[PDB]
Amino acid sequence: SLKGFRLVLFVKRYVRKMRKLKL
C-alpha cells in the first residue's frame, strides 16, 4: 500500500488473518 495511516493497516490485518488464521 502507498501509505495511509495505520488504521487502514489494521483493517487489512483482521481481514488478512481471517483468510488464514495463523496461530
Coordinates of N, CA and C in Angstrom, one line a residue:
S1 N 0.8 -1.2 0.0 CA 0.0 0.0 0.0 C 0.9 1.3 0.0
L2 N 0.4 2.3 -0.6 CA 1.1 3.6 -0.7 C 0.8 4.4 0.5
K3 N 1.2 3.8 1.7 CA 1.0 4.5 2.9 C -0.5 4.9 3.1
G4 N -0.8 5.4 4.2 CA -2.2 5.8 4.5 C -2.6 5.4 5.9
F5 N -2.0 6.1 6.9 CA -2.3 5.8 8.3 C -2.1 4.3 8.6
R6 N -2.3 4.0 9.9 CA -2.2 2.6 10.3 C -3.5 1.9 10.4
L7 N -4.6 2.7 10.5 CA -5.9 2.2 10.6 C -6.2 1.3 9.4
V8 N -5.9 1.8 8.2 CA -6.1 1.1 7.0 C -5.3 -0.2 7.0
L9 N -4.3 -0.2 7.9 CA -3.5 -1.4 8.0 C -4.1 -2.4 9.1
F10 N -4.9 -1.8 9.9 CA -5.5 -2.6 11.0 C -6.7 -3.3 10.4
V11 N -7.2 -2.8 9.3 CA -8.4 -3.4 8.7 C -8.0 -4.6 7.9
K12 N -6.9 -4.4 7.1 CA -6.4 -5.5 6.3 C -5.6 -6.5 7.2
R13 N -5.6 -6.2 8.5 CA -5.0 -7.1 9.4 C -5.9 -8.1 9.9
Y14 N -7.2 -7.7 10.2 CA -8.2 -8.6 10.7 C -8.8 -9.4 9.5
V15 N -8.7 -8.8 8.3 CA -9.2 -9.4 7.1 C -8.2 -10.4 6.5
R16 N -6.9 -10.1 6.8 CA -5.8 -10.9 6.4 C -5.6 -12.1 7.3
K17 N -6.1 -12.0 8.5 CA -5.9 -13.0 9.5 C -7.1 -14.0 9.4
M18 N -8.2 -13.5 8.8 CA -9.4 -14.3 8.6 C -9.1 -15.4 7.5
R19 N -8.6 -14.9 6.3 CA -8.4 -15.8 5.2 C -7.6 -17.1 5.7
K20 N -6.6 -16.9 6.5 CA -5.8 -18.0 7.0 C -5.3 -17.6 8.4
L21 N -6.0 -18.2 9.4 CA -5.7 -18.0 10.8 C -4.3 -18.6 11.1
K22 N -3.4 -17.7 11.4 CA -2.0 -18.1 11.7 C -2.1 -19.1 12.9
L23 N -1.6 -18.6 14.0 CA -1.6 -19.5 15.2 C -1.6 -18.6 16.5

